[PDB]
Design an enzyme around this catalytic site. Structure first.
Site, mmCIF file in Angstrom:
data_model
loop_
_atom_site.group_PDB
_atom_site.id
_atom_site.type_symbol
_atom_site.label_atom_id
_atom_site.label_comp_id
_atom_site.label_asym_id
_atom_site.label_seq_id
_atom_site.Cartn_x
_atom_site.Cartn_y
_atom_site.Cartn_z
ATOM 1 N N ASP A 8 48.625 46.443 40.555
ATOM 2 C CA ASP A 8 47.805 45.367 41.039
ATOM 3 C C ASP A 8 47.708 44.308 39.910
ATOM 4 O O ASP A 8 47.913 44.627 38.734
ATOM 5 C CB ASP A 8 46.436 45.940 41.405
ATOM 6 C CG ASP A 8 45.464 44.915 41.811
ATOM 7 O OD1 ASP A 8 45.837 44.087 42.618
ATOM 8 O OD2 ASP A 8 44.288 44.957 41.372
ATOM 9 N N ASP A 10 45.016 41.293 39.763
ATOM 10 C CA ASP A 10 43.617 40.928 39.500
ATOM 11 C C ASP A 10 42.758 42.169 39.165
ATOM 12 O O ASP A 10 42.649 43.094 39.936
ATOM 13 C CB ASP A 10 42.992 40.086 40.611
ATOM 14 C CG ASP A 10 41.530 39.726 40.271
ATOM 15 O OD1 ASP A 10 41.306 39.050 39.229
ATOM 16 O OD2 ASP A 10 40.629 40.258 40.943
ATOM 17 N N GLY A 46 39.020 37.475 47.987
ATOM 18 C CA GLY A 46 39.821 38.111 49.032
ATOM 19 C C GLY A 46 39.805 37.385 50.364
ATOM 20 O O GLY A 46 40.354 37.895 51.350
ATOM 21 N N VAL A 47 39.215 36.185 50.396
ATOM 22 C CA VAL A 47 38.995 35.438 51.640
ATOM 23 C C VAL A 47 39.886 34.192 51.639
ATOM 24 O O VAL A 47 40.080 33.558 50.593
ATOM 25 C CB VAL A 47 37.495 35.068 51.813
ATOM 26 C CG1 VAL A 47 37.272 34.203 53.058
ATOM 27 C CG2 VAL A 47 36.642 36.347 51.834
ATOM 28 N N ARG A 49 41.488 30.527 51.893
ATOM 29 C CA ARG A 49 41.008 29.293 51.256
ATOM 30 C C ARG A 49 40.188 28.432 52.261
ATOM 31 O O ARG A 49 39.218 27.779 51.885
ATOM 32 C CB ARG A 49 42.173 28.505 50.620
ATOM 33 C CG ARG A 49 41.775 27.135 50.065
ATOM 34 C CD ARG A 49 42.932 26.324 49.518
ATOM 35 N NE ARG A 49 43.857 25.872 50.559
ATOM 36 C CZ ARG A 49 45.185 26.058 50.579
ATOM 37 N NH1 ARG A 49 45.835 26.692 49.599
ATOM 38 N NH2 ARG A 49 45.889 25.589 51.604
ATOM 39 N N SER A 116 47.594 38.334 45.198
ATOM 40 C CA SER A 116 47.781 36.972 44.680
ATOM 41 C C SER A 116 49.082 36.325 45.162
ATOM 42 O O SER A 116 50.175 36.774 44.852
ATOM 43 C CB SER A 116 47.745 36.932 43.149
ATOM 44 O OG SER A 116 47.746 35.584 42.671
ATOM 45 N N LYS A 117 48.939 35.215 45.854
ATOM 46 C CA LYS A 117 50.063 34.350 46.190
ATOM 47 C C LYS A 117 50.539 33.576 44.989
ATOM 48 O O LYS A 117 51.531 32.897 45.108
ATOM 49 C CB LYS A 117 49.713 33.363 47.300
ATOM 50 C CG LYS A 117 48.872 33.923 48.458
ATOM 51 C CD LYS A 117 47.424 33.405 48.423
ATOM 52 C CE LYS A 117 46.373 34.361 47.839
ATOM 53 N NZ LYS A 117 45.898 34.137 46.433
ATOM 54 N N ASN A 118 49.853 33.625 43.847
ATOM 55 C CA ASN A 118 50.360 32.985 42.616
ATOM 56 C C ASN A 118 50.796 34.002 41.529
ATOM 57 O O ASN A 118 50.885 33.673 40.350
ATOM 58 C CB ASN A 118 49.338 31.986 42.074
ATOM 59 C CG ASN A 118 49.005 30.881 43.087
ATOM 60 O OD1 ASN A 118 49.695 29.831 43.167
ATOM 61 N ND2 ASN A 118 47.967 31.104 43.862
ATOM 62 N N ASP A 170 41.846 48.304 40.573
ATOM 63 C CA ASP A 170 40.445 48.081 40.209
ATOM 64 C C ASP A 170 39.538 48.032 41.445
ATOM 65 O O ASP A 170 38.322 47.944 41.278
ATOM 66 C CB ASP A 170 40.290 46.761 39.447
ATOM 67 C CG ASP A 170 40.515 45.551 40.330
ATOM 68 O OD1 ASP A 170 41.511 45.505 41.071
ATOM 69 O OD2 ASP A 170 39.708 44.614 40.284
HETATM 70 MG MG LIG Z 1 42.529 43.953 41.837
#
Ligand SMILES: [Mg+2]
EC number: 5.4.2.6
Length: 219
Positions: A8, A10, A46-47, A49, A116-118, A170
């Site tokens: 993962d 983040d 997690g929501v 944009r 993450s899309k980045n 996490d």
């Molecule tokens: Mg995470």
């Protein structure tokens, strides 16, 4: 031994959420809406944009045209992207760089399994791209965590079965996604959040290759 580690991003590799939080906070401040604080970011993390922008507007009961919505969405993007230009190797969480080197030193596959899309940009900024064999693209899975899809996809993107893999996470829903993939989860945080049936480390300095090998052998 395990043949892959599915990372993962983040909360494992880095604090990616801080940037989205700071972007929404700045936008709210700019347009005179109060209430977006660290606790409220729960609602935004997690929501989507666009769902996120709408929740923020609802704090002040404001309605807007499509063009003003678009404008405000763009502004948050501009904010976010400017901020992530400052990500560097100093933003890597403790243990992670040494873990990645040791995994590559030990010929174990490394893949990203992030919402993450980045992710690719962020890994590039952190000077981690070179360690990664693959990045599972969150745009290409039908279901997010806690569904297993992203961990399955990461394992497959390095030519392994999830049963040959460790997942690092996490988040409770991430731990669930790892479990349901076939992979072995090792959490960072506390059991109260992550569960009472997995190995959990208190912070990422404990994620060592030595420790993962011991967990693999004991499970
Ligand atoms: Mg995470």
């Amino acid at each position: 031994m395990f043949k892959a580690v599915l990372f993962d991003l983040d909360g494992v590799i880095t604090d990616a959420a801080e940037y989205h939080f700071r972007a929404w906070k700045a936008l709210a401040e700019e347009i005179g809406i109060n209430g977006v604080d660290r606790q409220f970011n729960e609602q935004l993390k997690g929501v989507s944009r666009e769902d996120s922008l709408q929740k923020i507007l609802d704090l002040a009961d404001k309605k807007v045209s499509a063009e003003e919505f678009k404008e405000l969405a763009k502004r948050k993007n501009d904010n976010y992207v400017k901020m992530i230009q400052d990500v560097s190797p100093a933003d890597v969480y403790p243990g992670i760089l040494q873990l990645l080197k040791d995994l590559r030193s030990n010929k174990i596959k490394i893949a990203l399994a992030s919402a993450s899309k980045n992710g690719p940009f962020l890994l590039e900024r952190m000077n981690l791209t070179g360690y990664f064999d693959a990045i599972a693209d969150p745009a290409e899975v039908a279901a997010s965590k806690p569904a297993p899809d992203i961990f399955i996809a990461a394992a497959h993107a390095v030519g392994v079965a999830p049963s040959e893999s460790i997942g690092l996470e996490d988040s409770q829903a991430g731990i669930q996604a790892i479990k349901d993939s076939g992979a072995l989860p090792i959490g960072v945080g506390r059991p109260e959040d992550l569960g009472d049936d997995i190995v959990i480390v208190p912070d990422t300095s404990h994620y060592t290759l030595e420790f993962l090998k011991e967990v693999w052998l004991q499970k």
